[model samples]
Target: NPVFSIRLKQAPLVPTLQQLALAHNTNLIIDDELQGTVSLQLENVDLDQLFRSVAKIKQLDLWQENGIYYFTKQLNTATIKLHFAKASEVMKSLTGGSGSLLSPNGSITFDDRSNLLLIQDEPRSVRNIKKLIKELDK
Candidate 1:
């Protein structure tokens, strides 16, 4: 449970965001179309609020799960097939290492005959989970 420290006054949108993701060593894929600036002097701020405010000002959607943060201009839903890894385990990990979901809507299902995962979630989340799935797959 580490905190984030940021010092900025009229900072550019792109580099600041890249700095945030880079500083935390986390996954953050932002749409290049998001253009704005940041003004702040913060210490020990929770990353959630920091990221939410950035997205809020940009009018971008923010979805965070499993330490990954994704910002997009608009919300999107998508489905993807998982070639390897147990679908249930992937679901569990996304749900804060338990049987719960960070967001209200999302699902992970596995077809036994096909032996693969069918995941329906925000494109951002699907992206996050896909990375987690493969890392744990080995």
Candidate 2:
């Protein structure tokens, strides 16, 4: 998510930003100091997919500026995180976290070689979970 909202000093630039936003079929939630919140609903928008994609990018600190949002792969390395949830899961999975309860009917899979882990919401065994963790940590 963006750290702060865009502070526009010019009125002429708003339309250019809105036009680009319409091209992406996203509605903007603008908070104007005087006019309050205004939404620009784009017609014929596949909102569900748009939102899903936006969610992922937002997690990496991507967002709109000057009424325009664009994805650029050129951001500096320090500002980007890859497989973001992986780091948190690494702590939970390895620590055998108290909150990491297995679903009553599911299984968990882990691959230490690749540091990949997955939990399935199906019939699971605690022994298998240990074995999976052991293998992954190897």
Candidate 3:
């Protein structure tokens, strides 16, 4: 089960998540790599939705194992291939000079010659990246 209601204001996710775990009376194991700040607000939303929303934003996954709640980066098992009419501009848009679509869980790469983008990330992130890429293509 999840929390009943919650509100966080630019709070550290580590402590906040721990608090939620306590509220649910369950063991929580957060990945050491998970470190960030989050500001969230909800009214009358269930625990499931809350966690799901957090996962979506943080590129994380929430699962229960033997009565313990684990929050970790979702597996980056899927790969996405994208072709852009203008590889140079597309790369700029995606990477913003960083040279990679870097996230907490995955990284995206591409070359100027092929104008092709390679995305390896969780399903949700891949989908979101595709959507953004489509918008950039226009």
Candidate 4:
């Protein structure tokens, strides 16, 4: 665990992490779309603690592979079993009005036997899906 502190006022988050790289001597890969700003005063705080704050405020998630930390809007996959609704109909409702039914960050399929909907999307979108499912369940 590493402890450090810094202060920034309405600073760009990307460059802020760049500065962190210089101090920590390791590098982070930032997503160009993960755009946001942060202003906080922290004292002797854990690095992960600081990152968790950034993740929420910036609408981002952190991933580590090959010892490199990546900050990006990563998609999560979940298979939700449905009881009161059919997966195919729910899929149509969610994908409607969107250009493509499936993309890198958007995909949904149904398993008939299991009555499950497999969805891959941002956490926010997934929550929306769940909300819509609940609304239609009744």
Candidate 5:
């Protein structure tokens, strides 16, 4: 069975996001109640300089499945595709990103920041997963 895959770019700005969230008092609610915190040390914090030395490590825990990778976020069910982690000879024609088993009605494009974000037009379900399994067997 072919697995869906996601290969995140090495330079994701998550730490930068965390710092910006803290400084700007943005959406700091990853935790139920204690996620967002007001830091009294905000003035001393240099958001840019603080994250400058932060190494961008791939968070494997965010991914699921051994061969196929699904978004840690829920799928809305519009499409699915066999994805590739490293660019393959054929995938290079599209772009240097991962692959997904998209719904027939799903759509694809890059964000303003050039991030690849595919959105499904419909809701996803267990039946969709079974379809994926069937396709894998094929």
Candidate 6:
């Protein structure tokens, strides 16, 4: 697993993210729109949490595709193909809400006929949705 212990307050953004990415043995790709200083005091936080924290702090999206970490301000659209018997429960877990998976800023539609989940939202949120689905199906 990718593990790290980072403690920084008002640190240069690029280099610090780079350090975390290196700890994960992954390449970091920062969006041109996301440029600024970053401050945090974290202890023994794993790389996954680190990435999520950065995404939340920077108000950006991040995902790993083809072994590279991508950060972006623009939203991403993705289609996840899944075949889980407990589809309803899976959707509930993914969405954390009620009868429909659609949200104000994003949407999740399950095509039972094709066993696919169509998702459209921020890249980081989409990544988390996919990750949750993966974990649930496993």
lDDT per residue for candidate 2 within 16-88, as digits (tens), equals: 5455556566665444555565333343358675775355334443233342111111111111121333423
lDDT of 1: 0.48
Q: Indicate the TM-score of model 2.
A: 0.21
What lDDT score is found at residue 65 in candidate 2? 30
lDDT score for residue 77 of model 5: 40
Q: Which ten residues in a row have the lowest lDDT in candidate 6?
A: 64-73
TM-scores for every predicted model = 0.33, 0.21, 0.35, 0.39, 0.18, 0.38
Which candidate ranks first by TM-score, i.e. highest?
A: 4
Higher-TM-score candidate of 2 and 5: 2
Residue range with the least summed lDDT across 10 consecutive positions in model 5: 53-62
lDDT digits (tens) for residues 3-91 of candidate 1: 11222344345655556645544444554434764344332256775565455446632432222222211334444456665555554
Off by over 4 Å in 2: 1-35, 41-85, 99-138
- Report how far residue 123 has shifted in candidate 6, in Å: 1.1
lDDT per residue as tens, model 5, 74-138: 43643233443322222233323565444444433323222223334345643454354334422
- What would the per-residue lDDT of candidate 6 be over residues 13-88, giving only the tens digit for each residue? 6665667656545555665544764345433347776666555446633332221111221668887667654554
Model 1 error, position 60 (Å): 55
lDDT of 4 by residue, 15-76 (tens): 65656544544445554434764334432246775565445445533332221111122887
The lDDT for every candidate, in the order shown, is: 0.48, 0.41, 0.50, 0.54, 0.37, 0.54
Error of 2 at 5 (Å): 21
Between prediction 1 and prediction 3, the one with superior TM-score is 3
List the candidate numbers ranked by TM-score, top first: 4, 6, 3, 1, 2, 5
The reply for model 1, stretches above 4 Å from the true place, is 1-84, 89-96
Q: Give me candidate 3's TM-score against the actual structure.
A: 0.35
